[PDB]
């Protein structure tokens, strides 16, 4: 069976319990922590790709009130539904799985200034979503799987002090 298993989720635990957020910025900035997963049940043999993408979790945006997170109004328009290709792509089942994949190099952007950056919206919650492709496939077959543990508000500075000292204690 194809398996994809969050790695430290367990640090995820703790960003998430505070609610997670992530800098966005003009020429994009890394996410910590990156996400990392295991992979089993792929065909050893057979070449994929791995993409990576952000989905929307909400209807509405968010502000920090009071050291809490609360709904802060309508939405803005859906950000441009950007992609990330993993740069090991394409490659073996037997690359994929022999290791932990890692996105370390992924840049969250709030302005469509090129380089492979994700454009998100500051104060919008987004769930991190990676789609393994088949190459060479005439069906196309892509597999997907969330990763609720890895939810974010992205934001232009960080809002709770306590995700800012996380940030550095763990980074
Ligand atoms: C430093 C590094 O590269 N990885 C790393 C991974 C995991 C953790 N912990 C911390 C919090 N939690 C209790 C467990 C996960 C911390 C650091």
Redesign the pocket.
Known sequence: ELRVGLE?S??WL?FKELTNEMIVTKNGRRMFPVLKVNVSGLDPNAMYSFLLDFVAADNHRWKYVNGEWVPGGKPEPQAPSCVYIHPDSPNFGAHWMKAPVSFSKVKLTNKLNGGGQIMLNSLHKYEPRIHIVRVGDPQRMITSHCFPETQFIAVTAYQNEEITALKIK?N
């Open positions: 430290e367990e640090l703790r763990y």
